[PDB]
Amino acid sequence: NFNLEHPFFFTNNDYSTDTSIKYQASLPFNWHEVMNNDEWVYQYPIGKFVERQGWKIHISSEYNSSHELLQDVAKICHEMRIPFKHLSTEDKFIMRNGKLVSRGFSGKFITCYPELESVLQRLESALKQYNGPYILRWDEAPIYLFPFAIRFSNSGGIYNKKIILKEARPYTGLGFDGTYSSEKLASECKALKILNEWSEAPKIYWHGKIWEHTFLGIEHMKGVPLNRWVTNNFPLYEVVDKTKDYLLRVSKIVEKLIDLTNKFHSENVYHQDLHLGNILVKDEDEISIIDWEQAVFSNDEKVVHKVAAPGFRAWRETLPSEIDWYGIRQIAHYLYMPLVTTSDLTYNYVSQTRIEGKKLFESLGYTREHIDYVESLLSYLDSKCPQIENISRKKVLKPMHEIRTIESEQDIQDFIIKLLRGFTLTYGQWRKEFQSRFFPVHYYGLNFNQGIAFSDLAILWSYQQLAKKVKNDDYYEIRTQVINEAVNNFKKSSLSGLFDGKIGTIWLIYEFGEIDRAVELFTTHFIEIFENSQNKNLYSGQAGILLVGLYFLSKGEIDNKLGEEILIRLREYTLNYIENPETFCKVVQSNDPYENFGGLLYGHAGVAWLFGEAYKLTGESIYKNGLELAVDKELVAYKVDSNNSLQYSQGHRLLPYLATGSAGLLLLINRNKEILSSKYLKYLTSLERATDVVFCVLPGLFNGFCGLEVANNIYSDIDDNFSGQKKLIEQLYRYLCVIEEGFVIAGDNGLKITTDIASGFAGVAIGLVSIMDNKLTILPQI
Amino acid sequence: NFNLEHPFFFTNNDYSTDTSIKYQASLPFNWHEVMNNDEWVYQYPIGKFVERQGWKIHISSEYNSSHELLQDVAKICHEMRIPFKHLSTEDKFIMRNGKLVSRGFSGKFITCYPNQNELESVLQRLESALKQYNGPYILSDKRWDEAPIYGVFRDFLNKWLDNAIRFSNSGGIYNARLKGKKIILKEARPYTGLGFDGTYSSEKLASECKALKILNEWSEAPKIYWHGKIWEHTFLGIEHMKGVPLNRWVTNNFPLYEVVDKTKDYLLRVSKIVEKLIDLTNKFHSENVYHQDLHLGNILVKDEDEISIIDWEQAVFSNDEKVVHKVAAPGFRAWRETLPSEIDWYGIRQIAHYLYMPLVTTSDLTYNYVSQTRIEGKKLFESLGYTREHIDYVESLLSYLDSKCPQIENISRKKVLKPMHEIRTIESEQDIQDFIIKLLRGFTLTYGQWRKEFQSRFFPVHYYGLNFNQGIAFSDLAILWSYQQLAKKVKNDDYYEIRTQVINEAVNNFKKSSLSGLFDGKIGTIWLIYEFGEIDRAVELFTTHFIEIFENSQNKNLYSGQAGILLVGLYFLSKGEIDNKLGEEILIRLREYTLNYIENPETFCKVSDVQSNDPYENFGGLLYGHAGVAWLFGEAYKLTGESIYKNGLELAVDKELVAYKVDSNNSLQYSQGHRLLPYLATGSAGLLLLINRNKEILSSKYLKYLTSLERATDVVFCVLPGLFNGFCGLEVANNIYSDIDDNFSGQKKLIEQLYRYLCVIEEGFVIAGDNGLKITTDIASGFAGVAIGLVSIMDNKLTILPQI
Ligand SMILES: Nc1nc2c(ncn2[C@@H]2O[C@H](COP(=O)(O)OP(=O)(O)OP(=O)(O)O)[C@@H](O)[C@H]2O)c(=O)[nH]1
C-alpha cells in the first residue's frame, strides 16, 4: 500500500521531504498564520463571529508569474474580514495542479471563504491580467465554482480510418521542469509534420480548438506490442521452434530499427522516448513507432531524461543523439533474453544476460553460422553510445562479467558462502537509516513482523539453518534483541495464522532455540490463539494453527491434557471438512499474497499437507479419504497446455512454480508415495514436462524458478544430489547482482534488493536446504 | 550544553537536517560504497588486507572548483591501487573549513589510504593532474608537496622530515603594537571562513581597505597604520583608541534607584549621543560608504560624550541592488532585502533606543521592538521627574530616526510576534486579575508549537537544563503544578489528560535517574505527587524508594543534596499521615544530621567569584547555599520546640553575612566576581526571605539587618523577568512576610514593572527567557516563575519550599 522510491530499498510514506521554494504573505495582526495540516497556513482571525462557513468561493493560479498574484491578494486583507490561506511550497503547487491528482483538488492555490457585500472592485482592478488553471460563476476574473477512453487523467486523455484523440486542456500537467502538455502537442505538430514521407508514422490533423483546447488526432496504426510477440514467440518450450529460423527473425528487427534510426537523425529531430510500448510490429514483421511527445529540436543542448517507461532512463546527462541510441541498444538486447527490468537500478545491466544467451542457444542447439551475426550487430551498437559514469548511489549494484560452470560439490560450497554475506551487507545498509522494522523487505510486506512471510525473524531462522547446513560475526546479540522484541509485542497484534499470524512465531520460538520458553508460551497462549473461529487457510487460518500444534504433540514435550483435546480439535476439524470444500478456499493477475485464491500456500493443497501429515501417527481411514479429495480439488483449475503439460490458469497469464502452480502439487505427490494410488502417482509424467522450462522471470521460491527446481529435485527415492543442484545453480545465475564479495536477489517487479521468503535472499536459502535435506523445512513435517 | 537556533524555541542537536550540492565518483568493477557515520562515503576494493597505523593521505579542496577535483582524482587513482573516502555534503565543507569548528578538524575533504609499498607510486601520477589546483593551509595534518595533497584504518616519504582576546578558526582578532601607537588587528588564512552566502575572510577583511581610506581624515573613524602581506595571511591594523562600550555605559550611568545621581539631567546627557550619530550617518552616506554592521559593542563612547565607531569590516560600496543581511549581531539584523544604505536605519536607529530603556535583545525574535522601550521610558522619567522640556525634544529627535527608517514588509514565520502598543494603569481588582486571565494563553500557545514539531520532551525549556526532566527546577511536573495554583486564584481546558501523562512518566522513568535531590532529583518528584493531589502514591513511593534514596545521596546542600530530603521528611512527620516507626527513624536521622552539622559548617557548603548563570556553578544563595540549611533548622525549631536547634540559625546567618559588601548607597549585596545580585535565589532577597517571620524566635541581634536589605532590594530596573534570577522575586521578598495586611503594593508594583518584558504572539503576554531569543515556560525565567510569585504574596508564605 505504501509505494515510494529510494535509492535501493522501498520505504513507507514517511521519508520524503519538502525542500522547495516556499510561499509567503507578509500580513499584519488580527490574523493568525498557524499551520495545522502542513499544506496551508491556516487562519481564523481575532475578534470574530465566524459564520457557519457554507458555500465557498475559489480563485486559481498559474506557474508563469505566481510570485505576483499572492502579494496582490495579501494587500486585499487590510480591508474587511476573510479567511486568508495559501499553499505552503511550490512542490504542493506542482502536485496539486499536475499529473495524477483528482479534479476536486486542482486549481486551488489561494483561498477565500464567504456576511459581506459579495463584491469588491479593487481586487478586480489589480487582477484580470492573470487567467488560467480553471476548475470544472458569479463574476469576472479567475473565479471558478466539432470536426468529428483507455487512460483517464485530469490533465488530458486518450480516446478512441478510425482516429485516436490526444487532447490537453490549457495550463495543466506541470512537471519538475516547467513544461506543459499543450507545450508538447506543438512539439509533435512540428516533429511529425517535419517527416511525413514514411509509412510507419501517422498524419497530423489538428481539427480545431473548440472552447480553447489543444487537440491532436492521429489514425489507428496496425501492429502488436513487441512484448506479446516475444512471449508468444520465444522458445520457452524446447520444441515450439520451427527447426531453427528465429535468430534469423531477430535480424529483421535488428536491421530495420538500425536502418530507420539513422535517417531521422538527418532531419534534426530526436525522439528521446524509446521503450517497448512504442515499437509495434505489424503482420509480416513490419515495424511502427508511436508517442513522439518528447522530441527536442536541438543537438548542442543537453537534457537529462525526465519521463520514460521502467527500464530505459539515461544516466547523468548526455547529448540527445545518445538518448535515442540507448533505446536501440537496450531494445536490441531485449530480444536476446527478456531481462531489462532491473536496469533502472543496475547500470550496464546487459552483459550477464547476453553472455549466458550464447550458452543457452548452444545448449538448445543452433547453428553457429546464423549465431555469428547478431553478436556483431550488438557489437556495432557499442560504438554509438559511449561509457557514462554511474552516480546517484545506485552504483554499487554491479553485474558480473565472468561465469564458470559447475563440476563438483565445492561449487555449491562456495555458492552458499557468497550468498550468506549478502545478508549482512543488506542489513548494514538498512539498520543505519531506519529503525521501524529491522530487516529490509519487499514493499507489500513493509509493515509485518510475524510468521513465515515478509518478516523479521523468519529470515533470521533461514540465515542460521543454512549456516548450520554449511560448515564454518554478531549473530547472538541480534538474536537476543529479536527474541526479546518478538515476545514483547506478542500481544496487540490482531491477526492469527501460521505464515502471517501468531502461532508462526510460536513455531520459531521452538525451532530457533529456547525449547522451554516455547512450551510455557504455548500453554499460556495457544487456546486464545485458537478458539476464535476466523479463517481456515494455511496462510492465515485454523489449519495453520492446528498443524503446528500436532507437530508439538508428536514432538514429545507436552502434557497429557493438551495432547488429548488438541487431537480432539483436529478430529473435529476434519469432521467439519466432511463434504464442503469451498469453506476454506476458492475452487486477474497479481504478485502480492492476499488477493490470490489458490495454489499450495494460498489454496487447497495446504489442507492436503495436514491430511497427509495426520495419517502417520493416526493410520485411520478418514484421514486417507480427505487426502485424495484435497489433492483432486486442487487440480480443478488446471488446463491442458499446448504441449502435453498442466499449468495453473489465472487470467491470460500462465503459472508455473511452487506457490500457485503445478510445482507445489508435484512436490506433494512426490512426498506421499506410499499412501497415494497408481491413478494419482502417474501424474508425475505430465507435470515433469511442465516444470522444466528454460525461462521464468521471477527468482524467488514463492515466485519462479527456485520453486520449479525444488519440486523436481527433492524426493525421487534416490540419493543423487549433484545433478539435483546443478540445474538450479546454472540457471539461477541470470537473476543475481553483485555487491562486494556476495550476491543479492531483487524481488518481483525488480528495482530493489530484498530479504524475504517471498522472493529474496531467504527463499533460495530455504530451497537449497530443501534440495539436500528432503523435508521442505518451512512446512511442518513430523 | 545543547544550543541550536530555530524560528521560535531552542532545541538540541537533532533538528538540523541537511541540504547541499552532493558529490561522489565512479567505480569500475572492483569496489563498494558504505555510509559510515553520515559525513563520509567510503570506497575500497572487494577483499584486500592492507595495513595498520602506517600512513594515509589527506586531500583538501576549494569551494569554487570542488567537483572538478573529485573527477580529477577519481580516475587517476582507480588505476593502480588507492582506496579513499571523502565528505558527502557541501554544508559540512562549510563546517570543516570554517570559523567555529576547532583546529583538530580542519583542512580535510578527501582521505586516502594507500598501501605501504606504494606510497611513492600512488601520488607520482596522481599529483600531475592536480597542478592547477590550490587549497587551505595545513592544520592537524602534515606537509607533503605542492597541489592539494598533503592515523588508523580499521615507504619513500621519510625524506621530507600585546595580548589576545579572541581565538577562532579564522585566525584571530588579536591586539599588538607596531614595530607603537597601538594597533587593533584582524587576521585571516587561505580560503577559510564561509557562510551560506559564502565569502572568505580575506574578502571581508579587504572589503574595508577602501572604506577606511575614503574616510581617513575624519576624527571619529579608525586610521589604518599598517596593511600588507607578510605571508598569504593578511594583517590589517587600525589604531586603538580609549573609551567604554555603550552597553556598559548605559548600566554605569542609568538611575537604578531614586537616589543614585543628583543634579537630575540625564535626558540632556542623551542629546549629544543622538545628534552626533544622526549627522554622522548622513556624513558618510554620500561618498559611497555603507556600513552594514552596527551594534552596542561597536560604539566606544569617550570622555564627555564622544562617539568612536570602529570595525567597518562589512562595507558595501554601491547601492543599486537589494541584498539580505548576512552576518547578524545579538539583537541587530536587517529584515528581507533592503539596500545597503537602509541597513543603517534598522541599524544606528536601535542603538540610540538603548539609551532610554536598555532592552533591545528580543528584537531578533520580535520585529521592531522599540515601542515598549520608548513608551515606558517617558512614564519612568515622569514618575522620577527630571525635566518635562527634554522629553518632547528627545522623543522628536528619536522620531526623526523613525522618519528616516523605511517600513519593511514583515515576512517570515518570526512575524506572529508584534510588540505591544497599549498599556493601562491598574488601580482596581479586575485589572490585576485580567493579566492572569490572559497570561494563561501565553502558556497554552507555547505548548502546541513545541510538541507538534519536536517530540523528545513535553514542554519548552531554557537550554541550560534541557535533558533534565526531573524536579522542582527545569522540569515537567513542577511546571504543570505551578499552573494549577495560579488557575485556582482566578475564577472559571482539558488538562486532566495532560496531568495524567505527566504523572505516568513522572514515575515510569524514576529508576533511570542517576541523581537525587530536592529541586532536580528523585525526591522532588516524590513530594510533587503529595502536593499535586495524590496522597497514597506519595507514601508508597516515599517508603519503598526514599529509603535507598537517602542511603545513596552524597551532597549536603538543598538543591541536589541531603538537606531537602530530611526537610520534606520533617514536613511529612509534621502532617504525620503515615510514618510512625519510619517517622521515629527519620527523627533519629535528623539527630545525627544536626550534631554532625554543628561541628564545622565549612565542609558542607562553601562560605562566589565566578560570573556564570549556570545552576551547578553556584556556591552561595538561598537555594544554592547555606540559607536552605537555616530553612530546615528554622522549621525544625517550630514543630518540636527543642532548644538545641535554635543554635543553627545564628550560625548560618553569621556565616552568610561575611560575603556581602557595603557600597555608597549602604546596600548589602551579593558578590559574584564583579556583579551585584539583588535576586531571590543568589543574593539579597534570600536573607530577607529568611529573617522575617523568624523574628518571634530571634530578638535583637538579627532584626537590625531587615531595613538595610529592605531599602537595598528597591531597584527601579533590572533586565531579567524571573524568580530565581530575575526581577519578580524582588517584589515578592520585600513584602512576603508582612505582619501588616498589604496586597496592592505586592500586586501593583510587580504588575506595572512587568509590562516592559512582554511580546504578544496572539492576544497573549508571553515572557521571554534568559538571553531572550526564545519563548520558554520554565520556573527560573518563564511562565512558572511569575505564576508562583504572584500566588506567593496572595497566600502570604511561599510556594517553593515545604512549610512545616
Ligand atoms: N579596549 C578596546 N577594545 C577594542 C578596541 N578596538 C577593538 N576592540 C575589541 O574588539 C572587539 C569587538 O568584538 P565583536 O563585537 O565581537 O566583533 P569581532 O571581534 O569582529 O567578532 P564578531 O562577533 O565575529 O564580529 C571588542 O570585544 C574589543 O575587545 C579598542 O579600540 N579599545
Side-chain angles (χ1 to χ4, degrees), chain A residues 26 32-33 35-36 75 389 391-392 395 398 401 432 740, chain B residues 24-25 27 29 31 33 44 46 75 409-410 415 452 762:
Chain A
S26 189
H32 284 203
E33 289 189 357
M35 61 80 71
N36 291 293
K75 281 169 182 180
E389 318 280 6
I391 303 299
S392 296
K395 62 180 179 291
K398 181 204 304 188
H401 290 149
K432 298 177 176 62
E740 171 50 284
Chain B
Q24 68 271 15
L27 72 165
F29 195 46
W31 282 271
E33 181 186 5
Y44 64 97
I46 61 170
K75 280 86 183 177
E409 292 181 354
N410 191 7
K415 73 150 200 293
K452 82 186 293 180
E762 291 162 1

mmCIF file of all heavy atoms in Angstrom, chain A residues 26 32-33 35-36 75 389 391-392 395 398 401 432 740, chain B residues 24-25 27 29 31 33 44 46 75 409-410 415 452 762:
data_model
loop_
_atom_site.group_PDB
_atom_site.id
_atom_site.type_symbol
_atom_site.label_atom_id
_atom_site.label_comp_id
_atom_site.label_asym_id
_atom_site.label_seq_id
_atom_site.Cartn_x
_atom_site.Cartn_y
_atom_site.Cartn_z
ATOM 1 N N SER A 26 3.206 38.101 4.121
ATOM 2 C CA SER A 26 3.501 39.369 4.802
ATOM 3 C C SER A 26 2.255 40.133 5.238
ATOM 4 O O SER A 26 1.967 41.218 4.723
ATOM 5 C CB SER A 26 4.378 40.285 3.945
ATOM 6 O OG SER A 26 4.801 41.398 4.709
ATOM 7 N N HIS A 32 -3.835 35.094 11.995
ATOM 8 C CA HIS A 32 -3.044 34.136 12.762
ATOM 9 C C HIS A 32 -1.782 33.633 12.061
ATOM 10 O O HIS A 32 -0.680 33.850 12.579
ATOM 11 C CB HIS A 32 -3.914 32.938 13.156
ATOM 12 C CG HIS A 32 -4.862 33.224 14.277
ATOM 13 N ND1 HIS A 32 -5.386 32.233 15.079
ATOM 14 C CD2 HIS A 32 -5.392 34.387 14.722
ATOM 15 C CE1 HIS A 32 -6.188 32.775 15.978
ATOM 16 N NE2 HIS A 32 -6.213 34.081 15.779
ATOM 17 N N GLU A 33 -1.919 32.988 10.899
ATOM 18 C CA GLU A 33 -0.924 32.107 10.282
ATOM 19 C C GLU A 33 -0.341 31.075 11.240
ATOM 20 O O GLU A 33 0.832 31.162 11.619
ATOM 21 C CB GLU A 33 0.225 32.876 9.628
ATOM 22 C CG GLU A 33 -0.132 33.611 8.357
ATOM 23 C CD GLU A 33 1.104 34.145 7.674
ATOM 24 O OE1 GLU A 33 2.200 33.982 8.246
ATOM 25 O OE2 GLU A 33 1.003 34.698 6.563
ATOM 26 N N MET A 35 0.064 26.866 11.168
ATOM 27 C CA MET A 35 -0.095 25.704 10.301
ATOM 28 C C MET A 35 -0.616 24.513 11.098
ATOM 29 O O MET A 35 -0.282 24.347 12.273
ATOM 30 C CB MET A 35 1.236 25.389 9.604
ATOM 31 C CG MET A 35 2.441 25.042 10.495
ATOM 32 S SD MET A 35 2.588 23.375 11.184
ATOM 33 C CE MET A 35 2.977 22.427 9.718
ATOM 34 N N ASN A 36 -1.480 23.709 10.473
ATOM 35 C CA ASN A 36 -2.015 22.521 11.126
ATOM 36 C C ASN A 36 -2.082 21.278 10.248
ATOM 37 O O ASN A 36 -2.181 20.172 10.791
ATOM 38 C CB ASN A 36 -3.410 22.808 11.702
ATOM 39 C CG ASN A 36 -3.363 23.769 12.872
ATOM 40 O OD1 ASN A 36 -2.827 23.447 13.932
ATOM 41 N ND2 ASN A 36 -3.913 24.955 12.683
ATOM 42 N N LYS A 75 -2.652 42.141 -0.058
ATOM 43 C CA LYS A 75 -2.970 43.533 0.242
ATOM 44 C C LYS A 75 -4.463 43.815 0.150
ATOM 45 O O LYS A 75 -4.885 44.952 0.385
ATOM 46 C CB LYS A 75 -2.181 44.460 -0.680
ATOM 47 C CG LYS A 75 -0.742 44.638 -0.237
ATOM 48 C CD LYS A 75 0.102 45.328 -1.286
ATOM 49 C CE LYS A 75 1.542 45.448 -0.815
ATOM 50 N NZ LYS A 75 2.403 46.131 -1.815
ATOM 51 N N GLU A 389 29.270 7.654 -16.526
ATOM 52 C CA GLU A 389 29.599 7.387 -15.134
ATOM 53 C C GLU A 389 28.316 7.036 -14.393
ATOM 54 O O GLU A 389 27.229 7.509 -14.735
ATOM 55 C CB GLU A 389 30.293 8.598 -14.493
ATOM 56 C CG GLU A 389 31.331 9.280 -15.389
ATOM 57 C CD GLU A 389 32.684 8.586 -15.431
ATOM 58 O OE1 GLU A 389 32.841 7.490 -14.854
ATOM 59 O OE2 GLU A 389 33.602 9.151 -16.064
ATOM 60 N N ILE A 391 26.407 7.460 -11.060
ATOM 61 C CA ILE A 391 26.315 8.296 -9.868
ATOM 62 C C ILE A 391 24.913 7.991 -9.330
ATOM 63 O O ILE A 391 24.276 7.033 -9.772
ATOM 64 C CB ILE A 391 26.579 9.783 -10.251
ATOM 65 C CG1 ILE A 391 27.956 9.888 -10.911
ATOM 66 C CG2 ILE A 391 26.777 10.764 -9.065
ATOM 67 C CD1 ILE A 391 29.127 9.465 -10.071
ATOM 68 N N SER A 392 24.471 8.745 -8.310
ATOM 69 C CA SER A 392 23.171 8.700 -7.632
ATOM 70 C C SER A 392 23.050 7.450 -6.771
ATOM 71 O O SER A 392 21.936 7.032 -6.435
ATOM 72 C CB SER A 392 21.990 8.800 -8.612
ATOM 73 O OG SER A 392 21.980 10.046 -9.284
ATOM 74 N N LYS A 395 24.923 2.795 -7.650
ATOM 75 C CA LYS A 395 26.112 2.468 -8.408
ATOM 76 C C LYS A 395 26.878 1.269 -7.873
ATOM 77 O O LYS A 395 27.805 0.806 -8.542
ATOM 78 C CB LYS A 395 27.022 3.699 -8.458
ATOM 79 C CG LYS A 395 27.520 4.183 -7.099
ATOM 80 C CD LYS A 395 28.409 5.413 -7.269
ATOM 81 C CE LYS A 395 28.905 5.955 -5.948
ATOM 82 N NZ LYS A 395 27.816 6.563 -5.134
ATOM 83 N N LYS A 398 26.521 -4.050 -9.334
ATOM 84 C CA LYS A 398 27.484 -4.335 -10.380
ATOM 85 C C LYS A 398 27.217 -5.701 -10.998
ATOM 86 O O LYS A 398 27.255 -6.713 -10.289
ATOM 87 C CB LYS A 398 28.870 -4.275 -9.748
ATOM 88 C CG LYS A 398 30.065 -4.522 -10.625
ATOM 89 C CD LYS A 398 31.194 -4.995 -9.719
ATOM 90 C CE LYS A 398 31.475 -3.982 -8.610
ATOM 91 N NZ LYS A 398 32.684 -4.306 -7.816
ATOM 92 N N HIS A 401 30.892 -10.273 -14.951
ATOM 93 C CA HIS A 401 31.436 -10.425 -16.296
ATOM 94 C C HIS A 401 31.933 -11.838 -16.577
ATOM 95 O O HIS A 401 32.020 -12.242 -17.739
ATOM 96 C CB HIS A 401 32.573 -9.422 -16.524
ATOM 97 C CG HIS A 401 32.115 -8.001 -16.617
ATOM 98 N ND1 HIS A 401 32.897 -6.939 -16.216
ATOM 99 C CD2 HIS A 401 30.953 -7.466 -17.059
ATOM 100 C CE1 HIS A 401 32.237 -5.811 -16.410
ATOM 101 N NE2 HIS A 401 31.055 -6.104 -16.922
ATOM 102 N N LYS A 432 21.243 1.412 9.464
ATOM 103 C CA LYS A 432 21.832 2.724 9.698
ATOM 104 C C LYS A 432 20.878 3.866 9.368
ATOM 105 O O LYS A 432 21.087 4.986 9.845
ATOM 106 C CB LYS A 432 23.115 2.880 8.884
ATOM 107 C CG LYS A 432 24.204 1.894 9.239
ATOM 108 C CD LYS A 432 25.408 2.078 8.336
ATOM 109 C CE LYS A 432 26.549 1.168 8.747
ATOM 110 N NZ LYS A 432 26.160 -0.265 8.643
ATOM 111 N N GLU A 740 29.896 -6.319 -3.422
ATOM 112 C CA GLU A 740 31.087 -6.755 -2.679
ATOM 113 C C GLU A 740 31.277 -8.256 -2.964
ATOM 114 O O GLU A 740 30.855 -8.716 -4.030
ATOM 115 C CB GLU A 740 30.920 -6.287 -1.202
ATOM 116 C CG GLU A 740 31.822 -6.684 -0.008
ATOM 117 C CD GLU A 740 33.292 -6.515 -0.259
ATOM 118 O OE1 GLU A 740 33.866 -7.355 -0.971
ATOM 119 O OE2 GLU A 740 33.886 -5.582 0.305
ATOM 120 N N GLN B 24 30.443 12.508 -5.246
ATOM 121 C CA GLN B 24 30.598 11.059 -5.425
ATOM 122 C C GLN B 24 31.080 10.712 -6.831
ATOM 123 O O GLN B 24 30.598 11.254 -7.828
ATOM 124 C CB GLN B 24 29.434 10.092 -5.015
ATOM 125 C CG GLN B 24 28.001 9.918 -5.676
ATOM 126 C CD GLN B 24 26.808 10.785 -5.197
ATOM 127 O OE1 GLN B 24 26.929 11.788 -4.516
ATOM 128 N NE2 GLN B 24 25.620 10.363 -5.607
ATOM 129 N N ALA B 25 32.083 9.833 -6.880
ATOM 130 C CA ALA B 25 32.762 9.379 -8.087
ATOM 131 C C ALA B 25 32.205 8.073 -8.648
ATOM 132 O O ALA B 25 31.132 7.619 -8.240
ATOM 133 C CB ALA B 25 34.242 9.209 -7.785
ATOM 134 N N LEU B 27 32.968 3.828 -10.041
ATOM 135 C CA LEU B 27 33.610 2.597 -9.579
ATOM 136 C C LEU B 27 33.572 1.532 -10.673
ATOM 137 O O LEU B 27 32.507 0.963 -10.959
ATOM 138 C CB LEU B 27 32.970 2.098 -8.260
ATOM 139 C CG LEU B 27 31.595 1.450 -7.996
ATOM 140 C CD1 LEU B 27 31.460 0.768 -6.639
ATOM 141 C CD2 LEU B 27 30.556 2.520 -8.161
ATOM 142 N N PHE B 29 34.025 -1.990 -11.500
ATOM 143 C CA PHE B 29 34.039 -3.451 -11.429
ATOM 144 C C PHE B 29 34.746 -4.076 -10.216
ATOM 145 O O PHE B 29 34.580 -5.277 -9.974
ATOM 146 C CB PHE B 29 34.639 -3.998 -12.739
ATOM 147 C CG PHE B 29 34.406 -5.471 -12.959
ATOM 148 C CD1 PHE B 29 33.150 -6.022 -12.758
ATOM 149 C CD2 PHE B 29 35.446 -6.302 -13.350
ATOM 150 C CE1 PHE B 29 32.928 -7.374 -12.946
ATOM 151 C CE2 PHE B 29 35.231 -7.657 -13.544
ATOM 152 C CZ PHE B 29 33.970 -8.194 -13.341
ATOM 153 N N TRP B 31 34.919 -2.689 -6.386
ATOM 154 C CA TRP B 31 34.710 -1.679 -5.340
ATOM 155 C C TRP B 31 33.333 -1.799 -4.694
ATOM 156 O O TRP B 31 32.490 -2.594 -5.115
ATOM 157 C CB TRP B 31 34.891 -0.220 -5.826
ATOM 158 C CG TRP B 31 36.286 0.320 -5.997
ATOM 159 C CD1 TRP B 31 37.009 0.927 -5.020
ATOM 160 C CD2 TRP B 31 37.095 0.381 -7.186
ATOM 161 N NE1 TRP B 31 38.220 1.326 -5.501
ATOM 162 C CE2 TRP B 31 38.310 0.992 -6.824
ATOM 163 C CE3 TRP B 31 36.931 -0.056 -8.501
ATOM 164 C CZ2 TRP B 31 39.345 1.194 -7.731
ATOM 165 C CZ3 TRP B 31 37.971 0.131 -9.394
ATOM 166 C CH2 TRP B 31 39.155 0.759 -9.008
ATOM 167 N N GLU B 33 30.618 0.835 -1.793
ATOM 168 C CA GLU B 33 30.359 2.085 -1.078
ATOM 169 C C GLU B 33 29.584 1.777 0.196
ATOM 170 O O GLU B 33 28.639 0.983 0.165
ATOM 171 C CB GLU B 33 29.550 3.062 -1.931
ATOM 172 C CG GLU B 33 29.269 4.399 -1.268
ATOM 173 C CD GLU B 33 28.350 5.269 -2.091
ATOM 174 O OE1 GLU B 33 27.866 4.787 -3.131
ATOM 175 O OE2 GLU B 33 28.119 6.434 -1.711
ATOM 176 N N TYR B 44 36.556 1.102 -1.383
ATOM 177 C CA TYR B 44 37.632 0.182 -1.048
ATOM 178 C C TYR B 44 37.490 -1.046 -1.940
ATOM 179 O O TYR B 44 36.390 -1.326 -2.432
ATOM 180 C CB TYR B 44 37.575 -0.177 0.449
ATOM 181 C CG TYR B 44 36.341 -0.928 0.898
ATOM 182 C CD1 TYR B 44 36.355 -2.308 1.007
ATOM 183 C CD2 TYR B 44 35.205 -0.254 1.317
ATOM 184 C CE1 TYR B 44 35.256 -2.998 1.444
ATOM 185 C CE2 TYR B 44 34.091 -0.939 1.752
ATOM 186 C CZ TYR B 44 34.125 -2.313 1.815
ATOM 187 O OH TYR B 44 33.027 -3.009 2.254
ATOM 188 N N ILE B 46 37.163 -4.964 -3.287
ATOM 189 C CA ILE B 46 36.346 -6.045 -2.755
ATOM 190 C C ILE B 46 37.251 -7.192 -2.287
ATOM 191 O O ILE B 46 37.476 -8.198 -2.968
ATOM 192 C CB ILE B 46 35.220 -6.415 -3.760
ATOM 193 C CG1 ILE B 46 35.697 -6.910 -5.132
ATOM 194 C CG2 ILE B 46 34.293 -5.231 -3.961
ATOM 195 C CD1 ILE B 46 34.588 -7.474 -5.987
ATOM 196 N N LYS B 75 39.665 8.990 -11.298
ATOM 197 C CA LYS B 75 40.114 8.062 -12.324
ATOM 198 C C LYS B 75 41.629 7.970 -12.379
ATOM 199 O O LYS B 75 42.168 7.124 -13.100
ATOM 200 C CB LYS B 75 39.572 8.477 -13.693
ATOM 201 C CG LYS B 75 38.129 8.068 -13.952
ATOM 202 C CD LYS B 75 37.141 9.097 -13.424
ATOM 203 C CE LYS B 75 35.718 8.634 -13.614
ATOM 204 N NZ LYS B 75 34.732 9.591 -13.048
ATOM 205 N N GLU B 409 8.080 45.466 4.773
ATOM 206 C CA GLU B 409 7.061 44.453 4.969
ATOM 207 C C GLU B 409 7.639 43.277 5.754
ATOM 208 O O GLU B 409 8.677 42.708 5.408
ATOM 209 C CB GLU B 409 6.504 43.972 3.632
ATOM 210 C CG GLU B 409 5.693 45.002 2.875
ATOM 211 C CD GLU B 409 5.148 44.455 1.573
ATOM 212 O OE1 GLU B 409 5.500 43.311 1.217
ATOM 213 O OE2 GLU B 409 4.373 45.169 0.904
ATOM 214 N N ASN B 410 6.953 42.930 6.836
ATOM 215 C CA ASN B 410 7.378 41.875 7.743
ATOM 216 C C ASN B 410 6.953 40.535 7.169
ATOM 217 O O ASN B 410 5.755 40.269 7.045
ATOM 218 C CB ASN B 410 6.761 42.074 9.128
ATOM 219 C CG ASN B 410 7.374 41.172 10.181
ATOM 220 O OD1 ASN B 410 8.351 40.467 9.927
ATOM 221 N ND2 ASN B 410 6.789 41.184 11.374
ATOM 222 N N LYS B 415 6.958 36.365 12.590
ATOM 223 C CA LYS B 415 6.181 37.573 12.349
ATOM 224 C C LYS B 415 4.778 37.456 12.922
ATOM 225 O O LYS B 415 3.934 38.333 12.714
ATOM 226 C CB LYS B 415 6.125 37.887 10.858
ATOM 227 C CG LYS B 415 5.237 36.972 10.067
ATOM 228 C CD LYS B 415 4.664 37.696 8.875
ATOM 229 C CE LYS B 415 3.447 36.983 8.366
ATOM 230 N NZ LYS B 415 3.872 35.668 7.817
ATOM 231 N N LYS B 452 4.380 19.878 18.384
ATOM 232 C CA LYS B 452 3.954 19.474 17.049
ATOM 233 C C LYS B 452 5.119 19.402 16.072
ATOM 234 O O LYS B 452 4.967 18.873 14.966
ATOM 235 C CB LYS B 452 2.882 20.431 16.528
ATOM 236 C CG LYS B 452 3.414 21.714 15.921
ATOM 237 C CD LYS B 452 2.266 22.644 15.580
ATOM 238 C CE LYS B 452 1.409 22.074 14.467
ATOM 239 N NZ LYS B 452 0.289 22.988 14.130
ATOM 240 N N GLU B 762 -0.251 36.088 19.996
ATOM 241 C CA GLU B 762 -1.630 36.323 19.574
ATOM 242 C C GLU B 762 -2.453 36.445 20.846
ATOM 243 O O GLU B 762 -2.637 35.448 21.549
ATOM 244 C CB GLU B 762 -2.177 35.194 18.689
ATOM 245 C CG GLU B 762 -1.559 35.070 17.300
ATOM 246 C CD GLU B 762 -1.804 33.722 16.658
ATOM 247 O OE1 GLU B 762 -2.472 32.873 17.282
ATOM 248 O OE2 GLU B 762 -1.311 33.507 15.534
#
